[PDB]
């Protein structure tokens, strides 16, 4: 059930069968989080999960898309993700369409863009790490020394993190590798979103929309405290459907809220099977 970065959540028959749902991992998690959604989809709906790969969002899609095509040929494609996973599903939809494939459904499970753009500037890096340092001070009750802004503002997100980690390790702090790697990859995967070069998509997108981001997302990036009515997708997607689901972002992937997603999604899938 594991093949490279592809997890089989429910296998498709040797030949024929219903259209698979492809799900994409959230930052800091695997596609096992889609098991509740799977329970609320029609019986025998196949489901395959795409796990983490490296690079910009575009570079990640460039590794996913050939695999998608190896598995599902010309389509139809049903692409679904929560959080980062929604952004990844979209980037794959864009890629698949350029190659002429048939993309029938893109499900964004509260993959809501920050309500203001995140500036890609040296000033914002300075401000960001000033905030992070102030939070570190209250939490671990230490006094943080002068941040070396000159070094930090010249680095990309992965460079910034590597620098801060090296400083932390230098400072004498010993942290178990699993915790570091989980924190580091979650952080960088969520930051990857900020520079996703988002393209218009000519098909149907469903955005399942919670009420708000949870506090930790806002502490990660304060601009997530604001949401636009189209979740930031309205300019790029002509055929955008929004389905309000309530709750917080972190609740959207679980029961009971996931039942509302699965019920609507089940109807979309049903229509796809009829149109076959």
Author numbering: 1451 to 1726
Give verbatim lines from the article:
In Mtb, Pks13 performs the final assembly step of mycolic acid synthesis, i.e., the Claisen-type condensation of a C26 α-alkyl branch and C40–60 meromycolate precursors (Portevin et al., 2004). It is comprised of five domains, including two acyl carrier protein domains, a β-ketoacyl-synthase, an acyltransferase, and a C-terminal thioesterase (TE) domain, that together contain all of the activities required for the condensation of two long-chain fatty acids. The overall structure of Pks13-TE consists of a core domain and a lid domain. The Pks13-TE active-site pocket is formed at the interface between the lid and core domains.
Two laboratory-derived mutant strains resistant to TAM1 were found to harbor non-synonymous mutations, i.e., either D1607N or D1644G, both located in the TE domain of Pks13. The crystal structure of the D1607N mutant explained its more subtle effect on binding, through the loss of ion pair interaction between the carboxylate of Asp1607 on helix α6 and the guanidinium of Arg1641 (3 Å) located on the parallel helix, α7. Without this interaction, α7 shifts away from the substrate-binding groove by about 3 Å, moving Asp1644 out of hydrogen-bonding distance from the P4 OH of TAM1.
